[PDB]
Amino acid sequence: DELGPVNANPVAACNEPLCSFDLDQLKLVAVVTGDASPVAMVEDPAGRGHIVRRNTRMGRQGGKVTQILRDSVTVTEVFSGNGEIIKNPVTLQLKPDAKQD
Amino acid sequence: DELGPVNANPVAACNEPLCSFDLDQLKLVAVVTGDASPVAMVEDPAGRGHIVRRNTR
Amino acid sequence: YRGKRVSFEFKDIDIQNLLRVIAEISKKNIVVADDVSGKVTIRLRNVPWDQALDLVLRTKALGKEEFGNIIRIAPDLMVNLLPVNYAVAADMAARVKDVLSERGSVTVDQRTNVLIVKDVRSNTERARSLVRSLDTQTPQV
Amino acid sequence: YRGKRVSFEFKDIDIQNLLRVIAEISKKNIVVADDVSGKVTIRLRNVPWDQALDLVLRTKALGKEEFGNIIRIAPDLMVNLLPVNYAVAADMAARVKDVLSERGSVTVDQRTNVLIVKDVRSNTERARSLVRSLDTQTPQV
């Protein structure tokens, strides 16, 4: 009586995805620049690619895109510094070889 | 009743391996160096290759 | 097929992402089909985009068809601009075609007598050495 | 395809180990498939890695595909850099291709007009003797 109404509503959208994942998990793949304004390209810990640009956001801390270079991308993030909500001016570099804990 | 739950949990990890074998048994195969920092490559008495770098054990 | 100058750096990204990114920069509104291809790597400097695009197509990627407002696309390496000060770009075409053979890589001739190459660094290097070497007998006027 | 300079010495090691080692040195994050190949021996000096890699592929090893952040790789000899001070590297290509025949060994042309060879010492020696010998008629300006 519910299957015989053969009904599926496919996934193709954003999950609203990167605002569900932390900013230091995200890795800068590439940058595009031309007449349509500069845009950064960034990789999830789930291996998805995204495209974001100045005034847009990413990450659980709502990291706002403020600058875009060729090697790196400055963003403004939202951290709880000792109990205060404060700005964190992070700069996501491109992906080389690197390791941390 | 335990086989019919057909269940295997494959080996692919480190065994935590070289901390179970003595240091004079291990043989230096090669060294790699580049922007990702220098890394040594070393051989077990069991003939496995490993990769280890400054601050590791 | 004319645009602002750009530098395309794509390290292991979906061509669909490069495409969207290219639409977010006012290089048309670009839309793919659904499953066009996959992921590619390119790194360009000083290339107008509409070219870096034609050049992206040849890498792995697709061909482009434009409706007008929207364009549909359906199923390091580097780019460097060579100035040709002395010779005409078309006179190089015989020799440059002859290095490529059945390889990858390409050469594009812009109207202002500049050559543009996408390829692996090793095929770029060869093409530059030949273009400059033939340019150099042309400077002795 | 650009990196810090390195010396690769691998005495009877899994290409998967050489790969990881190459990721531990910030030469991307490299990941193989599972069963790529086996074990190889190479010994390089003064070679940027991204090249010592292309060169490792040709030995026994695999081809490389990059996603961007990660790269997937799927299924003594030495390397020496030859400076070419006088001639263009591409003019050597005819003669150098002609020694290789259906052998192993390769030659890579870097953009700064240097040749790089991987091979057995005996094929390296031949390639150096020819490159230097042809360079030497070019120094008499």
Coordinates of all heavy atoms in Angstrom, one line a residue, chain C, unseen atoms left out:
Chain C
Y1 N 34.5 33.4 -27.6 CA 36.0 33.0 -27.6 C 36.8 34.3 -27.4 O 37.3 34.8 -28.4
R2 N 36.6 35.0 -26.3 CA 37.4 36.1 -25.8 C 37.0 36.3 -24.4 O 35.9 36.4 -24.1
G3 N 38.1 36.6 -23.6 CA 37.8 36.7 -22.1 C 38.9 37.5 -21.4 O 40.0 37.7 -21.9
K4 N 38.7 37.8 -20.1 CA 39.8 38.2 -19.2 C 40.8 37.1 -19.1 O 40.5 35.9 -19.1
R5 N 42.1 37.5 -18.8 CA 43.2 36.6 -18.5 C 43.2 36.1 -17.1 O 42.9 36.9 -16.1
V6 N 43.7 34.9 -17.0 CA 43.5 34.1 -15.8 C 44.6 33.2 -15.6 O 45.6 33.1 -16.4
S7 N 44.7 32.5 -14.4 CA 45.6 31.4 -14.2 C 44.7 30.3 -13.6 O 43.9 30.6 -12.7
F8 N 44.7 29.2 -14.3 CA 44.0 28.0 -13.8 C 44.8 27.0 -13.1 O 45.4 26.2 -13.8
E9 N 44.6 26.8 -11.9 CA 45.2 25.8 -11.1 C 44.2 24.9 -10.5 O 43.3 25.3 -9.8
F10 N 44.2 23.6 -11.0 CA 43.3 22.5 -10.6 C 44.0 21.3 -10.2 O 44.6 20.6 -11.1
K11 N 44.1 21.0 -9.0 CA 44.7 19.8 -8.4 C 43.8 18.8 -8.0 O 43.6 18.5 -6.9
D12 N 43.5 17.9 -9.0 CA 42.6 16.7 -8.8 C 41.2 17.2 -8.4 O 40.8 17.1 -7.2
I13 N 40.5 17.7 -9.4 CA 39.2 18.2 -9.2 C 38.2 17.8 -10.3 O 38.6 17.6 -11.5
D14 N 37.0 17.7 -10.0 CA 35.9 17.3 -11.0 C 35.8 18.3 -12.1 O 35.7 19.5 -11.8
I15 N 35.8 17.9 -13.3 CA 35.7 18.9 -14.4 C 34.4 19.7 -14.3 O 34.3 20.8 -14.7
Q16 N 33.4 19.0 -13.7 CA 32.1 19.7 -13.3 C 32.3 20.9 -12.4 O 31.7 21.9 -12.5
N17 N 33.2 20.7 -11.4 CA 33.6 21.8 -10.5 C 34.3 22.8 -11.3 O 33.8 23.9 -11.4
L18 N 35.4 22.5 -12.1 CA 36.1 23.5 -12.9 C 35.1 24.3 -13.8 O 35.2 25.5 -13.9
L19 N 34.2 23.6 -14.4 CA 33.2 24.2 -15.2 C 32.4 25.2 -14.4 O 32.2 26.4 -14.9
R20 N 31.8 24.9 -13.2 CA 31.0 25.8 -12.4 C 31.8 27.0 -11.9 O 31.3 28.1 -12.1
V21 N 33.0 26.7 -11.5 CA 33.9 27.7 -11.1 C 34.1 28.7 -12.3 O 34.1 29.9 -12.2
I22 N 34.3 28.1 -13.5 CA 34.4 28.9 -14.7 C 33.0 29.6 -15.0 O 33.1 30.8 -15.1
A23 N 31.8 29.1 -14.7 CA 30.6 29.9 -14.8 C 30.5 31.0 -13.6 O 30.1 32.2 -14.0
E24 N 31.0 30.8 -12.4 CA 31.0 31.7 -11.3 C 31.9 33.0 -11.5 O 31.8 34.0 -10.8
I25 N 32.8 32.9 -12.5 CA 33.7 33.9 -12.9 C 33.1 34.6 -14.2 O 33.9 35.2 -15.0
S26 N 31.8 34.5 -14.6 CA 31.1 35.2 -15.7 C 31.5 34.8 -17.1 O 31.2 35.3 -18.1
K27 N 32.3 33.7 -17.1 CA 32.6 32.9 -18.3 C 31.4 32.1 -18.7 O 31.5 30.8 -18.6
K28 N 30.4 32.8 -19.2 CA 29.1 32.3 -19.5 C 28.4 31.8 -18.2 O 29.0 31.7 -17.1
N29 N 27.2 31.2 -18.4 CA 26.7 30.2 -17.4 C 27.0 28.9 -18.1 O 26.4 28.5 -19.1
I30 N 27.9 28.1 -17.5 CA 28.2 26.8 -17.9 C 27.4 25.8 -17.2 O 27.3 25.8 -15.9
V31 N 26.8 24.8 -17.9 CA 26.1 23.6 -17.3 C 26.6 22.3 -18.1 O 26.8 22.4 -19.3
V32 N 27.0 21.3 -17.4 CA 27.3 20.0 -18.0 C 26.0 19.2 -18.3 O 24.9 19.7 -18.0
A33 N 26.1 18.1 -19.0 CA 25.2 16.9 -18.8 C 25.3 16.5 -17.3 O 25.8 17.2 -16.4
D34 N 24.8 15.3 -16.9 CA 25.1 14.8 -15.5 C 26.5 14.2 -15.5 O 27.5 14.9 -15.3
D35 N 26.7 12.9 -16.0 CA 27.9 12.2 -15.9 C 28.8 12.4 -17.2 O 28.5 11.9 -18.3
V36 N 29.6 13.5 -17.1 CA 30.5 13.9 -18.2 C 31.8 13.1 -18.2 O 32.3 13.0 -19.3
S37 N 32.4 12.8 -17.1 CA 33.8 12.3 -17.2 C 34.3 11.9 -15.8 O 34.2 10.7 -15.4
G38 N 34.9 12.8 -15.1 CA 35.5 12.6 -13.8 C 36.3 13.9 -13.4 O 36.0 15.0 -13.7
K39 N 37.4 13.5 -12.8 CA 38.4 14.4 -12.3 C 39.6 14.7 -13.2 O 40.0 13.7 -13.9
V40 N 40.2 15.9 -13.2 CA 41.4 16.2 -14.0 C 42.3 17.2 -13.2 O 41.9 18.0 -12.4
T41 N 43.6 17.2 -13.6 CA 44.6 18.1 -13.1 C 45.2 18.9 -14.3 O 45.7 18.4 -15.2
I42 N 45.1 20.3 -14.1 CA 45.8 21.2 -15.0 C 46.4 22.4 -14.2 O 45.8 22.8 -13.1
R43 N 47.4 23.1 -14.7 CA 47.9 24.4 -14.1 C 48.5 25.3 -15.1 O 49.6 25.4 -15.5
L44 N 47.7 26.4 -15.4 CA 47.8 27.4 -16.4 C 48.2 28.7 -15.7 O 47.6 29.1 -14.7
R45 N 49.0 29.5 -16.4 CA 49.3 30.9 -16.1 C 49.1 31.8 -17.3 O 49.5 31.4 -18.4
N46 N 48.5 33.0 -17.0 CA 48.4 34.0 -18.0 C 47.5 33.6 -19.3 O 47.8 34.0 -20.4
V47 N 46.5 32.8 -19.1 CA 45.7 32.3 -20.2 C 44.3 32.9 -20.1 O 43.8 32.7 -19.0
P48 N 43.7 33.6 -21.0 CA 42.3 33.9 -21.1 C 41.5 32.6 -21.0 O 41.9 31.5 -21.4
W49 N 40.4 32.7 -20.2 CA 39.8 31.5 -19.8 C 39.2 30.6 -20.9 O 38.9 29.4 -20.7
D50 N 38.6 31.3 -21.9 CA 37.9 30.7 -23.1 C 38.8 29.8 -23.9 O 38.4 28.7 -24.3
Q51 N 40.0 30.2 -23.8 CA 41.1 29.3 -24.2 C 41.4 28.3 -23.2 O 41.5 27.1 -23.6
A52 N 41.7 28.6 -21.9 CA 42.0 27.6 -20.9 C 41.0 26.5 -20.9 O 41.4 25.3 -20.8
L53 N 39.7 26.8 -21.2 CA 38.6 25.9 -21.5 C 38.9 25.1 -22.7 O 38.8 23.9 -22.5
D54 N 39.1 25.6 -24.0 CA 39.3 24.8 -25.2 C 40.4 23.7 -24.9 O 40.3 22.5 -25.0
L55 N 41.4 24.2 -24.2 CA 42.5 23.5 -23.8 C 42.2 22.5 -22.7 O 42.9 21.5 -22.5
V56 N 41.2 22.7 -21.8 CA 40.7 21.8 -20.8 C 40.0 20.6 -21.5 O 40.3 19.5 -21.1
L57 N 39.1 20.9 -22.5 CA 38.4 19.9 -23.3 C 39.4 18.9 -23.9 O 39.4 17.8 -23.3
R58 N 40.5 19.3 -24.5 CA 41.6 18.5 -25.0 C 42.3 17.6 -24.1 O 43.2 16.8 -24.5
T59 N 42.4 18.1 -22.8 CA 43.1 17.3 -21.8 C 42.4 15.9 -21.6 O 42.9 14.9 -22.1
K60 N 41.2 15.9 -21.2 CA 40.4 14.7 -20.9 C 38.9 14.9 -21.2 O 38.1 14.0 -21.1
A61 N 38.6 16.2 -20.9 CA 37.3 16.7 -20.8 C 36.7 16.8 -22.2 O 36.9 16.0 -23.1
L62 N 35.6 17.5 -22.2 CA 34.5 17.3 -23.1 C 34.6 18.1 -24.4 O 35.6 18.8 -24.5
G63 N 33.6 18.2 -25.2 CA 33.4 19.3 -26.1 C 32.3 20.3 -25.6 O 31.5 19.9 -24.7
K64 N 32.3 21.5 -26.0 CA 31.3 22.5 -25.6 C 30.4 22.9 -26.7 O 30.9 23.4 -27.7
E65 N 29.1 23.0 -26.4 CA 28.1 23.6 -27.3 C 27.4 24.8 -26.6 O 26.9 24.6 -25.4
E66 N 27.3 26.0 -27.2 CA 26.6 27.1 -26.6 C 25.2 27.3 -27.1 O 25.0 27.6 -28.3
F67 N 24.2 27.4 -26.2 CA 22.9 27.9 -26.5 C 22.8 29.5 -26.7 O 22.0 30.0 -27.5
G68 N 23.6 30.2 -25.9 CA 23.9 31.6 -26.1 C 24.2 32.2 -24.7 O 25.3 32.4 -24.2
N69 N 23.1 32.2 -23.9 CA 23.2 32.6 -22.4 C 23.9 31.5 -21.6 O 24.7 31.7 -20.7
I70 N 23.4 30.3 -21.8 CA 23.9 29.0 -21.1 C 24.7 28.3 -22.2 O 24.4 28.4 -23.4
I71 N 25.7 27.5 -21.8 CA 26.4 26.6 -22.6 C 26.2 25.2 -22.0 O 26.3 25.0 -20.8
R72 N 26.0 24.2 -22.9 CA 26.0 22.8 -22.4 C 27.3 22.1 -22.8 O 27.9 22.3 -23.9
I73 N 27.9 21.4 -21.9 CA 29.1 20.6 -22.1 C 28.7 19.1 -21.9 O 28.2 18.7 -20.9
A74 N 29.1 18.3 -22.9 CA 28.8 16.9 -22.9 C 30.0 16.0 -23.2 O 30.9 16.3 -23.9
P75 N 29.9 14.8 -22.7 CA 30.8 13.6 -22.9 C 30.7 13.1 -24.3 O 30.6 11.8 -24.5
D76 N 52.5 18.6 -12.7 CA 51.5 19.4 -13.5 C 51.8 19.4 -15.0 O 52.9 19.5 -15.5
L77 N 50.6 19.7 -15.6 CA 50.5 20.2 -16.9 C 50.4 21.6 -16.7 O 49.6 22.1 -16.0
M78 N 51.0 22.3 -17.8 CA 50.9 23.7 -17.7 C 50.7 24.2 -19.1 O 50.7 23.6 -20.1
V79 N 50.2 25.5 -18.9 CA 50.0 26.3 -20.1 C 50.9 27.6 -19.9 O 50.9 28.2 -18.8
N80 N 51.5 27.9 -21.0 CA 52.4 29.0 -21.2 C 52.1 29.6 -22.5 O 51.7 28.9 -23.5
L81 N 52.1 30.9 -22.5 CA 52.0 31.8 -23.7 C 53.4 32.0 -24.2 O 54.3 32.4 -23.4
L82 N 53.7 31.7 -25.4 CA 54.9 32.1 -26.2 C 54.6 33.3 -27.0 O 53.7 33.3 -27.8
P83 N 55.3 34.5 -26.8 CA 55.3 35.5 -27.8 C 56.1 35.0 -29.0 O 57.1 34.4 -28.8
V84 N 55.6 35.3 -30.2 CA 56.4 35.2 -31.4 C 56.6 36.7 -31.9 O 55.6 37.3 -32.3
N85 N 57.8 37.3 -31.6 CA 58.0 38.6 -32.1 C 58.3 38.7 -33.5 O 57.8 39.7 -34.2
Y86 N 59.1 37.8 -34.1 CA 59.7 38.0 -35.4 C 59.0 37.2 -36.5 O 58.8 37.8 -37.6
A87 N 58.7 36.0 -36.3 CA 58.1 35.1 -37.3 C 56.6 35.2 -37.2 O 56.0 35.6 -36.2
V88 N 55.9 34.7 -38.3 CA 54.5 34.4 -38.2 C 54.2 33.1 -37.5 O 54.9 32.1 -37.7
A89 N 53.2 33.0 -36.7 CA 52.8 31.8 -35.9 C 52.5 30.5 -36.8 O 53.0 29.4 -36.5
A90 N 51.9 30.8 -38.0 CA 51.5 29.7 -38.9 C 52.7 28.9 -39.5 O 52.7 27.7 -39.7
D91 N 53.9 29.6 -39.7 CA 55.1 29.0 -40.2 C 55.7 27.9 -39.2 O 56.2 26.9 -39.6
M92 N 55.5 28.1 -37.9 CA 55.8 27.1 -36.9 C 54.9 25.9 -37.0 O 55.3 24.8 -36.5
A93 N 53.7 26.0 -37.5 CA 52.7 24.9 -37.5 C 53.1 23.6 -38.0 O 52.9 22.6 -37.3
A94 N 53.9 23.5 -39.1 CA 54.4 22.3 -39.6 C 55.3 21.5 -38.6 O 55.0 20.5 -38.1
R95 N 56.3 22.2 -38.0 CA 57.3 21.7 -37.0 C 56.6 21.3 -35.7 O 57.1 20.4 -35.0
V96 N 55.7 22.2 -35.2 CA 55.0 22.0 -34.0 C 54.1 20.8 -34.1 O 54.1 19.9 -33.2
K97 N 53.3 20.6 -35.2 CA 52.5 19.5 -35.5 C 53.4 18.2 -35.4 O 53.0 17.2 -34.7
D98 N 54.5 18.3 -36.0 CA 55.5 17.2 -36.1 C 56.1 16.7 -34.7 O 56.2 15.5 -34.5
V99 N 56.3 17.6 -33.7 CA 56.6 17.1 -32.4 C 55.4 16.3 -31.8 O 55.6 15.3 -31.1
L100 N 54.2 16.9 -31.9 CA 53.0 16.3 -31.2 C 52.8 14.8 -31.6 O 52.7 14.0 -30.7
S101 N 52.9 14.5 -32.9 CA 52.6 13.2 -33.4 C 51.2 12.8 -32.9 O 50.3 13.6 -32.9
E102 N 51.0 11.6 -32.4 CA 49.8 11.1 -31.7 C 49.9 11.3 -30.2 O 49.5 10.5 -29.4
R103 N 50.6 12.4 -29.7 CA 50.6 12.8 -28.3 C 49.6 13.9 -28.1 O 49.5 14.9 -28.8
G104 N 49.6 14.0 -26.7 CA 48.8 15.0 -25.9 C 49.7 16.0 -25.3 O 50.7 15.8 -24.7
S105 N 49.0 17.1 -25.2 CA 49.5 18.3 -25.7 C 48.6 18.8 -26.9 O 48.0 18.1 -27.6
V106 N 48.7 20.1 -26.9 CA 48.2 20.9 -28.1 C 48.8 22.2 -28.1 O 49.2 22.8 -27.1
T107 N 48.7 22.8 -29.3 CA 49.1 24.2 -29.6 C 47.9 25.0 -30.2 O 47.0 24.4 -30.8
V108 N 47.6 26.2 -29.7 CA 46.6 27.1 -30.1 C 47.3 28.4 -30.6 O 47.9 29.1 -29.8
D109 N 46.8 28.8 -31.8 CA 47.3 30.1 -32.4 C 46.3 31.2 -32.1 O 45.1 31.1 -32.4
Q110 N 46.7 32.2 -31.3 CA 45.9 33.4 -31.0 C 46.2 34.4 -32.1 O 47.3 34.6 -32.6
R111 N 45.2 35.3 -32.4 CA 45.2 36.3 -33.5 C 46.4 37.3 -33.4 O 46.8 37.8 -34.4
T112 N 46.8 37.6 -32.2 CA 47.9 38.5 -32.0 C 49.3 37.9 -32.1 O 50.3 38.3 -31.5
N113 N 49.4 36.8 -32.9 CA 50.6 36.0 -33.2 C 51.4 35.6 -31.9 O 52.6 35.8 -31.7
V114 N 50.6 35.0 -31.0 CA 51.2 34.3 -29.9 C 50.7 32.8 -29.9 O 49.6 32.5 -30.2
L115 N 51.7 31.9 -29.7 CA 51.3 30.5 -29.5 C 51.0 30.2 -28.1 O 51.7 30.7 -27.1
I116 N 50.0 29.3 -27.9 CA 49.7 28.8 -26.5 C 49.7 27.3 -26.6 O 49.0 26.7 -27.3
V117 N 50.4 26.7 -25.6 CA 50.6 25.3 -25.4 C 49.9 24.8 -24.1 O 50.2 25.4 -23.1
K118 N 49.1 23.8 -24.1 CA 48.9 22.9 -23.0 C 49.6 21.7 -23.2 O 49.3 21.1 -24.3
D119 N 50.1 21.1 -22.2 CA 50.7 19.8 -22.1 C 51.4 19.5 -20.8 O 51.4 20.4 -19.9
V120 N 51.9 18.3 -20.7 CA 52.9 18.0 -19.7 C 54.0 19.1 -19.8 O 54.4 19.5 -20.9
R121 N 54.7 19.4 -18.7 CA 55.9 20.2 -18.7 C 57.0 19.8 -19.8 O 57.5 20.6 -20.5
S122 N 57.2 18.5 -19.9 CA 58.2 18.0 -20.9 C 57.9 18.3 -22.3 O 58.8 18.7 -23.1
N123 N 56.6 18.1 -22.8 CA 56.2 18.5 -24.1 C 56.1 20.0 -24.3 O 56.7 20.6 -25.2
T124 N 55.7 20.8 -23.2 CA 55.8 22.3 -23.2 C 57.2 22.8 -23.5 O 57.5 23.7 -24.3
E125 N 58.2 22.2 -22.7 CA 59.6 22.6 -22.8 C 60.1 22.4 -24.3 O 60.7 23.4 -24.8
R126 N 59.8 21.3 -24.9 CA 60.2 21.0 -26.3 C 59.6 22.0 -27.2 O 60.4 22.7 -27.8
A127 N 58.3 22.2 -27.1 CA 57.6 23.2 -28.0 C 58.2 24.6 -27.8 O 58.6 25.2 -28.8
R128 N 58.4 25.1 -26.6 CA 59.1 26.4 -26.4 C 60.5 26.4 -27.0 O 60.8 27.5 -27.6
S129 N 61.3 25.4 -26.8 CA 62.7 25.4 -27.3 C 62.7 25.6 -28.8 O 63.4 26.4 -29.3
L130 N 61.8 24.9 -29.5 CA 61.7 25.0 -31.0 C 61.1 26.3 -31.4 O 61.7 27.0 -32.3
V131 N 60.0 26.8 -30.8 CA 59.4 28.1 -31.1 C 60.4 29.2 -30.9 O 60.7 30.0 -31.9
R132 N 61.1 29.3 -29.8 CA 62.1 30.3 -29.5 C 63.3 30.1 -30.5 O 63.9 31.2 -30.9
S133 N 63.7 28.9 -30.8 CA 64.9 28.7 -31.7 C 64.6 29.2 -33.1 O 65.4 29.9 -33.6
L134 N 63.4 28.9 -33.6 CA 63.0 29.4 -34.9 C 62.7 30.9 -34.9 O 62.8 31.6 -35.9
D135 N 62.2 31.4 -33.7 CA 62.0 32.9 -33.6 C 63.4 33.4 -33.7 O 63.7 33.9 -34.8
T136 N 64.5 32.9 -32.9 CA 65.8 33.5 -33.0 C 66.5 33.7 -34.3 O 67.3 34.7 -34.4
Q137 N 66.3 32.9 -35.3 CA 66.9 33.2 -36.7 C 66.1 34.3 -37.4 O 66.8 35.3 -37.9
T138 N 64.9 34.5 -37.1 CA 64.0 35.6 -37.4 C 64.4 37.0 -36.8 O 64.4 38.0 -37.5
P139 N 64.8 37.2 -35.5 CA 65.4 38.4 -35.0 C 66.7 39.0 -35.7 O 66.9 40.2 -35.5
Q140 N 67.5 38.1 -36.3 CA 68.6 38.7 -37.1 C 68.1 39.2 -38.4 O 67.9 38.5 -39.4
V141 N 67.6 40.5 -38.4 CA 67.1 41.2 -39.5 C 68.2 41.9 -40.3 O 69.4 41.7 -40.0

